[PDB]
Amino acid sequence: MAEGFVVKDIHFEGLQRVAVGAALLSMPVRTGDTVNDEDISNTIRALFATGNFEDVRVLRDGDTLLVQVKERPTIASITFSGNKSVKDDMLKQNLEASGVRVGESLDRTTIADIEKGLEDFYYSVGKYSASVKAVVTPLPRNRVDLKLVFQEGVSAEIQQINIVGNHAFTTDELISHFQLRQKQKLAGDLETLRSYYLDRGYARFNIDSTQVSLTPDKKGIYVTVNITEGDQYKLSGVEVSGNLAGHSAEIEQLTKIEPGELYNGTKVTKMEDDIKKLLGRYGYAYPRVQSMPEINDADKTVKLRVNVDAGNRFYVRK
C-alpha cells in the first residue's frame, strides 16, 4: 500500500534531441500525481521504450521528480570500406531496413548484431566467410560516425544441393531449373524454387529451412533445402480495395480472371504491376499495392485480396 510523494514538478537532465514536451508525453506521470516506486518503475520503463535513450534514471528530489537521461548518439555518417562485390548503396539499404541510418540513433548495445547482420547479408552473394568490423567514432553534440570495415572473403560455389519434402516434383526436375535458362547462386535457386511452386498453384508452398555446410577450404558449399509443398489451389476471386483515386472501375477490370483457374504467383505480380502502371498514367508515381491470399484448405481455393493506395499525385510543370 505504501504511499509515495506528490510531484510538485519535474526536472530533466540529459535532454538534447528529445523535446521536453515529447519526453513528458511519453511519461506515465505528471505534476500533481502521487508517485511511488511502482510509478517510477513505469516511468523508467516507459522512457526506455521510446528507444531514444541509452540510460534512464528517475528519482525523488524533495518534491521534484528528477529524470536523468543519456540519449543515444546520432549517427552523422556511415561509411562502408573494403567492400567491392557488394556496393555502398546496397549495404546502406540493408542497414536502413534494419533500423540503422544516418540521422537516427545508434543503440550501442546492438553493434555486434549490425556486424553479424551484414556478414549474413553477404550470404546473398555467395560469400560465407565475410567479416565486418564496426568502428564507432564519438563526435560533438552527442554524435557518432559509423565505419564498417569489410573483408569479403572468398566466394563459394555450390558443390551439391538436395531437396527434402518434394513429392509432386522430382529433385532432378526442380534442380534442372537452377541451371539458368556451378551456375546460379543459392539465393537465386531458392527464389526459382519458390516461384516454381507458386506458379503452379501451390499457394501453401514454403521453404522451411536451408542447411549450408561450408567446405574446409571455404570455396564450396553443400545445400539441403527442406520444403513443404502443400496442395494445388484454384483461384476463386480477386478483391481490390483501398484508395483507388477514382479508378476502381479500370483497376477492377484488371482483376479479371477465369473463376477457378490455378493459383499463379507470377500472374499476381503482373496484375499488381499492371495496377501500378495504370495509376502511373494518371499522375501517381508511387502507389502502394500489396496482395494477401485467403486460403480455404477445405475446398483448395484461394481468394486474392489486393490493397491499393494511389498515394501522392505528383504534378510537374516546366
Ligand SMILES: [Mg+2]
Ligand atoms: Mg566502400
